[PDB]
Design an enzyme around this catalytic site. Sequence first.
Site, PDB file in Angstrom:
ATOM      1  N   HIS A 183      -7.732  -0.523  -4.805  1.00  0.00           N
ATOM      2  CA  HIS A 183      -7.509  -0.085  -3.429  1.00  0.00           C
ATOM      3  C   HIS A 183      -8.413   1.076  -3.016  1.00  0.00           C
ATOM      4  O   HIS A 183      -8.923   1.105  -1.885  1.00  0.00           O
ATOM      5  CB  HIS A 183      -6.044   0.301  -3.232  1.00  0.00           C
ATOM      6  CG  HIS A 183      -5.118  -0.876  -3.161  1.00  0.00           C
ATOM      7  ND1 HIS A 183      -4.269  -1.090  -2.093  1.00  0.00           N
ATOM      8  CD2 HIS A 183      -4.927  -1.913  -4.017  1.00  0.00           C
ATOM      9  CE1 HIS A 183      -3.585  -2.199  -2.308  1.00  0.00           C
ATOM     10  NE2 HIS A 183      -3.966  -2.717  -3.464  1.00  0.00           N
ATOM     11  N   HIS A 218     -27.547  14.159  -4.463  1.00  0.00           N
ATOM     12  CA  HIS A 218     -28.847  14.403  -5.103  1.00  0.00           C
ATOM     13  C   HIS A 218     -29.084  13.767  -6.494  1.00  0.00           C
ATOM     14  O   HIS A 218     -29.873  14.274  -7.288  1.00  0.00           O
ATOM     15  CB  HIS A 218     -29.250  15.896  -5.059  1.00  0.00           C
ATOM     16  CG  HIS A 218     -30.732  16.121  -5.098  1.00  0.00           C
ATOM     17  ND1 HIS A 218     -31.529  15.698  -6.141  1.00  0.00           N
ATOM     18  CD2 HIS A 218     -31.563  16.719  -4.216  1.00  0.00           C
ATOM     19  CE1 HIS A 218     -32.785  16.029  -5.894  1.00  0.00           C
ATOM     20  NE2 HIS A 218     -32.827  16.675  -4.746  1.00  0.00           N
ATOM     21  N   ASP A 253      -0.954   8.739  -1.584  1.00  0.00           N
ATOM     22  CA  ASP A 253      -0.837   9.914  -2.448  1.00  0.00           C
ATOM     23  C   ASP A 253      -1.700  10.996  -1.799  1.00  0.00           C
ATOM     24  O   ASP A 253      -2.905  10.809  -1.644  1.00  0.00           O
ATOM     25  CB  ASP A 253      -1.351   9.519  -3.846  1.00  0.00           C
ATOM     26  CG  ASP A 253      -1.626  10.701  -4.765  1.00  0.00           C
ATOM     27  OD1 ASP A 253      -1.543  11.896  -4.367  1.00  0.00           O
ATOM     28  OD2 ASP A 253      -1.931  10.408  -5.929  1.00  0.00           O
ATOM     29  N   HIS A 290     -26.452  18.013  -1.342  1.00  0.00           N
ATOM     30  CA  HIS A 290     -27.605  18.854  -1.136  1.00  0.00           C
ATOM     31  C   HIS A 290     -28.033  18.687   0.328  1.00  0.00           C
ATOM     32  O   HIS A 290     -28.076  17.560   0.843  1.00  0.00           O
ATOM     33  CB  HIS A 290     -28.733  18.443  -2.083  1.00  0.00           C
ATOM     34  CG  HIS A 290     -30.021  19.160  -1.833  1.00  0.00           C
ATOM     35  ND1 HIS A 290     -30.327  20.361  -2.431  1.00  0.00           N
ATOM     36  CD2 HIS A 290     -31.072  18.857  -1.036  1.00  0.00           C
ATOM     37  CE1 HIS A 290     -31.522  20.758  -2.026  1.00  0.00           C
ATOM     38  NE2 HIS A 290     -31.990  19.864  -1.176  1.00  0.00           N
ATOM     39  N   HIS A 300      -3.185  14.524  -2.454  1.00  0.00           N
ATOM     40  CA  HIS A 300      -3.373  15.561  -3.481  1.00  0.00           C
ATOM     41  C   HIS A 300      -2.907  16.901  -2.938  1.00  0.00           C
ATOM     42  O   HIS A 300      -2.709  17.838  -3.701  1.00  0.00           O
ATOM     43  CB  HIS A 300      -4.833  15.721  -3.895  1.00  0.00           C
ATOM     44  CG  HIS A 300      -5.404  14.553  -4.647  1.00  0.00           C
ATOM     45  ND1 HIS A 300      -6.713  14.529  -5.076  1.00  0.00           N
ATOM     46  CD2 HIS A 300      -4.858  13.370  -5.025  1.00  0.00           C
ATOM     47  CE1 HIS A 300      -6.937  13.390  -5.704  1.00  0.00           C
ATOM     48  NE2 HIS A 300      -5.825  12.678  -5.704  1.00  0.00           N
ATOM     49  N   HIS A 338       0.867  -1.183   0.000  1.00  0.00           N
ATOM     50  CA  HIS A 338       0.000   0.000   0.000  1.00  0.00           C
ATOM     51  C   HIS A 338       0.900   1.228   0.000  1.00  0.00           C
ATOM     52  O   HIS A 338       2.080   1.135   0.335  1.00  0.00           O
ATOM     53  CB  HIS A 338      -0.905   0.067   1.260  1.00  0.00           C
ATOM     54  CG  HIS A 338      -1.759  -1.150   1.487  1.00  0.00           C
ATOM     55  ND1 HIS A 338      -2.985  -1.328   0.886  1.00  0.00           N
ATOM     56  CD2 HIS A 338      -1.583  -2.226   2.288  1.00  0.00           C
ATOM     57  CE1 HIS A 338      -3.514  -2.473   1.272  1.00  0.00           C
ATOM     58  NE2 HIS A 338      -2.681  -3.040   2.125  1.00  0.00           N
ATOM     59  N   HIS A 391      -5.295   9.158  -0.892  1.00  0.00           N
ATOM     60  CA  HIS A 391      -5.718   7.802  -1.142  1.00  0.00           C
ATOM     61  C   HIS A 391      -4.505   6.941  -1.433  1.00  0.00           C
ATOM     62  O   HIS A 391      -3.420   7.446  -1.662  1.00  0.00           O
ATOM     63  CB  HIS A 391      -6.725   7.715  -2.315  1.00  0.00           C
ATOM     64  CG  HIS A 391      -6.175   8.168  -3.637  1.00  0.00           C
ATOM     65  ND1 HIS A 391      -5.576   7.308  -4.531  1.00  0.00           N
ATOM     66  CD2 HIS A 391      -6.140   9.394  -4.219  1.00  0.00           C
ATOM     67  CE1 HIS A 391      -5.186   7.982  -5.600  1.00  0.00           C
ATOM     68  NE2 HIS A 391      -5.519   9.250  -5.438  1.00  0.00           N
ATOM     69  N   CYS A 392      -4.702   5.635  -1.397  1.00  0.00           N
ATOM     70  CA  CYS A 392      -3.647   4.679  -1.669  1.00  0.00           C
ATOM     71  C   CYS A 392      -3.593   4.451  -3.169  1.00  0.00           C
ATOM     72  O   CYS A 392      -4.638   4.379  -3.839  1.00  0.00           O
ATOM     73  CB  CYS A 392      -3.948   3.363  -0.947  1.00  0.00           C
ATOM     74  SG  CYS A 392      -2.732   2.004  -1.152  1.00  0.00           S
ATOM     75  N   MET A 437      -9.668   2.729   0.567  1.00  0.00           N
ATOM     76  CA  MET A 437      -8.441   3.389   0.955  1.00  0.00           C
ATOM     77  C   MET A 437      -8.361   4.815   0.430  1.00  0.00           C
ATOM     78  O   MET A 437      -7.701   5.073  -0.593  1.00  0.00           O
ATOM     79  CB  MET A 437      -7.216   2.586   0.519  1.00  0.00           C
ATOM     80  CG  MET A 437      -6.911   1.412   1.420  1.00  0.00           C
ATOM     81  SD  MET A 437      -5.222   0.775   1.305  1.00  0.00           S
ATOM     82  CE  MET A 437      -4.383   1.900   2.418  1.00  0.00           C
ATOM     83  N   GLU A 478     -28.468  25.494  -3.959  1.00  0.00           N
ATOM     84  CA  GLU A 478     -29.335  24.372  -3.581  1.00  0.00           C
ATOM     85  C   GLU A 478     -28.535  23.060  -3.503  1.00  0.00           C
ATOM     86  O   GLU A 478     -28.652  22.297  -2.551  1.00  0.00           O
ATOM     87  CB  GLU A 478     -30.516  24.236  -4.519  1.00  0.00           C
ATOM     88  CG  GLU A 478     -30.156  24.022  -5.970  1.00  0.00           C
ATOM     89  CD  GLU A 478     -31.365  24.131  -6.820  1.00  0.00           C
ATOM     90  OE1 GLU A 478     -32.415  23.524  -6.489  1.00  0.00           O
ATOM     91  OE2 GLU A 478     -31.279  24.824  -7.844  1.00  0.00           O
ATOM     92  N   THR A 479     -27.679  22.850  -4.493  1.00  0.00           N
ATOM     93  CA  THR A 479     -26.930  21.592  -4.678  1.00  0.00           C
ATOM     94  C   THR A 479     -25.587  21.967  -5.279  1.00  0.00           C
ATOM     95  O   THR A 479     -25.527  22.890  -6.109  1.00  0.00           O
ATOM     96  CB  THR A 479     -27.711  20.723  -5.626  1.00  0.00           C
ATOM     97  OG1 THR A 479     -28.988  20.482  -5.040  1.00  0.00           O
ATOM     98  CG2 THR A 479     -27.025  19.395  -5.934  1.00  0.00           C
TER      99      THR A 479
HETATM  100 CU   LIG Z   1      -3.758   0.190  -0.608  1.00  0.00          CU
HETATM  101 CU   LIG Z   2     -34.341  17.739  -3.627  1.00  0.00          CU
HETATM  102 CU   LIG Z   3      -5.693  10.859  -6.743  1.00  0.00          CU
END
Ligand SMILES: [Cu+2]
Ligand SMILES: [Cu+2]
Ligand SMILES: [Cu+2]
Lengths: 329, 329, 329
Positions: free
Chosen positions: A134, A295, A86, A244, A88, A83, A123-124, A139, A268-269
Amino acid sequence: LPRVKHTLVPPPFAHAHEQVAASGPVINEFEMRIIEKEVQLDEDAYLQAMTFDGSIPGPLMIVHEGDYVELTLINPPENTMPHNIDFHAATGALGGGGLTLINPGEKVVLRFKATRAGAFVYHCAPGGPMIPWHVVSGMAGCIMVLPRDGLKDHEGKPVRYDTVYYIGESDHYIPKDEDGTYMRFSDPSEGYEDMVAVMDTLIPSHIVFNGAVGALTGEGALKAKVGDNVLFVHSQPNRDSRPHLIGGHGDLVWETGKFHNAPERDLETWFIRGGSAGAALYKFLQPGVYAYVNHNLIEAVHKGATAHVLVEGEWDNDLMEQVVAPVGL
Amino acid sequence: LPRVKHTLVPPPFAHAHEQVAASGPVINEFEMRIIEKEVQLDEDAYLQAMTFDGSIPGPLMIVHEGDYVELTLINPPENTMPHNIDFHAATGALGGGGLTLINPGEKVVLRFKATRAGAFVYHCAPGGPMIPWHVVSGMAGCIMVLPRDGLKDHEGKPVRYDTVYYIGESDHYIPKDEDGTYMRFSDPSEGYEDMVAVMDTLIPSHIVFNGAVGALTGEGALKAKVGDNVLFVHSQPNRDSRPHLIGGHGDLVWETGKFHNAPERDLETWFIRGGSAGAALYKFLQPGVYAYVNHNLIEAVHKGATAHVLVEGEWDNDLMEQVVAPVGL
Amino acid sequence: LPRVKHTLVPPPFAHAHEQVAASGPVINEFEMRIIEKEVQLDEDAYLQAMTFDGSIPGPLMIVHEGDYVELTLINPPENTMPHNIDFHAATGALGGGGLTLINPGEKVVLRFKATRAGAFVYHCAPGGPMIPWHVVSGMAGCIMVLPRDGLKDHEGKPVRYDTVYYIGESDHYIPKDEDGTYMRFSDPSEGYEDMVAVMDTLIPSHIVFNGAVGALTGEGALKAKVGDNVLFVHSQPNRDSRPHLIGGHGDLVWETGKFHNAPERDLETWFIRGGSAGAALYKFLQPGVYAYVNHNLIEAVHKGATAHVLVEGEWDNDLMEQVVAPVGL
Ligand SMILES: [Cu+2]
Ligand SMILES: [Cu+2]
Ligand SMILES: [Cu+2]
Ligand SMILES: [Cu+2]
Ligand SMILES: [Cu+2]
Ligand SMILES: [Cu+2]
């Protein structure tokens, strides 16, 4: 620099932190332990999970722009897979992935500088087809890098939240025995090829908040009071979502999740792009039960993407009134 | 306050209204009647619809920021289901859903305050798995809350439209008899379990504007003249869309649909998140036929997401010229 | 006006151009030749392609806001289909589609004025169900219309790139013989009905950058140096994408791709709407291998949406350090 150890809190809660940096740049020390285990997603649906710290999502790390992050990542010998991680949030070497590939029974310590304000996925990413697999086994988690100066709004004025909740949304591809019931396996690598066929259809079997259908309802229900200003941090490492707040709005919303960009208001969303994290601030005006959903309502209801917020305080009839209760024709 | 009754116009048209509020805050009275009926979506494809006022989408309501909305919602005894209404425009009680659950043969009157400028979805949300199902059977429409001061642009200067069209996009999941033709049912609740299986695949059979394939083409074709500034209000209550005006642009575009946010300019294609409504203003420069599409062209053409605009006026050869007509090699 | 002929360069490279317009408005002359041929997408997967100039995507055209574009489009007699061109950059007649429908053995010359700054899709749009099909067979490319004044940033200050790469992403729907292997055909129109069934599922078999899985890896690997400021222009004519630079960021990002709109900054992942093109500027700080992906990681890895950037220069340990290499527990 000063160094600060952190004790991580599983989601949707967050370890203690300040909004505006008390001090100057520090080195933030986190440690996580990779755990491969079978988790329950639903009434009769299980996943060969792979986690950071036992939870889906992996826990929220909080720091300030300009800090450093030093993480000890550990892969216990009972785990069957290599494993990595990373961020971001990080710059260089595949977000740290190229420096943290550890086997069952090893550890690594990575440091990077949080040069950039916002919430970010980690994430892995073990390489090739291990990358999607993964991640869709759980992960992934988030790291929020607050500006030193705290949160600013669209016109540059400070905004403070009273509560941050971390909503980790995650899509999963559980295969089915011939009888149309969900398969179970004794380990992840046993489940691999069956999960692949499902993945290639790009239709998730489940899509959940904080690990499982209903995980943030019932006793998991989020909580607040009228007058509370709540930051909702929402991550989706692999697939788009459209959050939402039913009965509410996003007062200020960074849907791309990066705090030096002007937020949008009155939404709203909003839209969380797969491979990112977003943030929405809301001040509760009405008490009662709210739902926080993805939503696409098929995703929210048939797939698992629904959380509840329970809000107490004073009902304001100006905003909403039932003028005539449900009476017959 | 002053009270104003409204007579609703089915979409894509809009009841009369002012852009900038003539007067001060008023109480807007609307009434709607829920109608459960079978509708035609295509050449040989039908839907056990459930509607607000007989139409998909439900009609456009227009008000101004600061007004109130008082709606009498009515569910005639010939209907087989309970229903309610959630306005994303409203604050409290699940957007009004928790105060408007009425049975076949009942009515309710809800009031809420339109505190927030923008176009907003309203849809029926009866609880649990009834939520996705009622929405994907057509129970959704839009309410536009204009700023009192009228529409402002990116630098804060007023903008006025000459015409608003309301494009209600909607995704539907029609199941199939064994022979690969679309199933028909005598009532909605009869169609339920077959529709569910389709819904769980997240692949719509149809995706339409104003109720049916070709509904906004042929005699339904939208209309304008060169020099017309047209506001295109576009809703998708359950699934993302990417609207595009073929041969045109979005001059000013609030893709998240909330008017106190700066619009984007010069857009080829914009993005309506499932569970929201957006708005794009365009000034026609060239006469002729245009298409307004969802720009996943499979959705636009195979699924139904295409409207036409017929524009008359003077052709400007500066903007576009056929220098050499289709001549042989 | 002055006229300028252009020699097109296949993607991901770009014909020579200036950022800020040297001179005043000119007439840009391009010519393209439609080529229908079978292309390889993967290890054992082929497509009955239809191209502008032999490549997927069609080549990048560059001009300045205010210029004109005069394109000679040619359809050689060995081609089996009619074809046209719709520039989203253009105003009128379906983006030029209604003036450029030419048969096998014909040509046409279209002129339009580039009134609008940004990157824009152009694609073939023959009418009805031919529209989706020609596009998902590869007939799409991009045209970038730079402001005369060059690129400006969020506060209005100039920004210049040292390199533009054009990433053309494209989704494809290859049908399968009964044996679960990908079908092959002798011509496009032979493959039609089988491709349709796949298209109606809205699940792509492949999703690729610059024409094929791994096309921008290996010897196709993109290149740069620490300190390089690279503009990544990214098009998706039919389906959404969520680009992400693994180990990097988008420093300034116009996800809707239109340069007079303020960019967003510090993005982990951005969003290209189907039927549009976007642009992200990044200044490389760390040397090494990066991946540029569609961040639905199933799309990036199982479907083909992964490119590589190879960056040389000096490693800065401040940004990232491996504190403790992978040592045992
Ligand atoms: Cu992993
Ligand atoms: Cu709605
Ligand atoms: Cu990524
Ligand atoms: Cu209903
Ligand atoms: Cu063509
Ligand atoms: Cu197009």
